[PDB]
Design a protein around this ligand. Sequence first.
Ligand SMILES: COC(=O)N[C@H](C(=O)N[C@@H](Cc1ccc(-c2ccccn2)cc1)C[C@H](O)[C@H](Cc1ccccc1)NC(=O)[C@@H](NC(=O)OC)C(C)(C)C)C(C)(C)C
Lengths: 99, 99
Amino acid sequence: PQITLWQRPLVTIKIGGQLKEALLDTGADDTVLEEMSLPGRWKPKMIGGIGGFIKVRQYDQILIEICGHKAIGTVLVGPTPVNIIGRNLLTQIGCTLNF
Amino acid sequence: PQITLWQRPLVTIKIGGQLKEALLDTGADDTVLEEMSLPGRWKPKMIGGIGGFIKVRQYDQILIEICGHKAIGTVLVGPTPVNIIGRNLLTQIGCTLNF
Ligand SMILES: COC(=O)N[C@H](C(=O)N[C@@H](Cc1ccc(-c2ccccn2)cc1)C[C@H](O)[C@H](Cc1ccccc1)NC(=O)[C@@H](NC(=O)OC)C(C)(C)C)C(C)(C)C
């Protein structure tokens, strides 16, 4: 669809059976979700924001539906205040910025 | 224009006669620029992201040009790793998320 930016671009996502709310974020290279269970093994990764870095677990090839649109790719899990859909998955669902 | 997301959405902005590179950031409430000088009064503000909060300087009613689009709004200045155009200004230039 078309999402204007007067409010936070919060959308519904489906991941490992559960429905959650996520922020669509063009300012993020990666996708980062709050603490949860995912299948397979994970690698270590550190990701940086405005106030410093956090330690997250990296899962690969994770199935995730974003607002009707399927995506399969990298999901990081850790102590983020918000669920963040970053560019790795925004490109898969054909997301672009327009004006 | 239509900005894709394979790479970071970095555009040229004009603020205080200075040309600067900034990140178009839908996941940001506020607009935050690295250390620079601006005219007028200011208030301190605390803003949070991944890893926590930083203290910044809040300037009101600042004019910014983003890809030749004029816009007026609040500009925060402080020790951010990157120049960031948040939703408060992206709405002014008519910027939408599409897929
Ligand atoms: C309401 O709070 C805000 O709007 N905070 C904004 C903010 O931090 N937004 C983040 C989203 C966010 C929103 C709210 C909170 C929050 C905090 C406390 C309480 C509630 N919510 C936290 C994060 C996502 C933002 O796009 C950020 C921009 C950035 C990019 C690169 C370096 C520093 C900052 N992206 C990241 O942090 C990403 N970093 C990255 O890609 O590095 C290359 C990730 C996400 C991958 C680490 C801001 C500060 C830019 C205005």
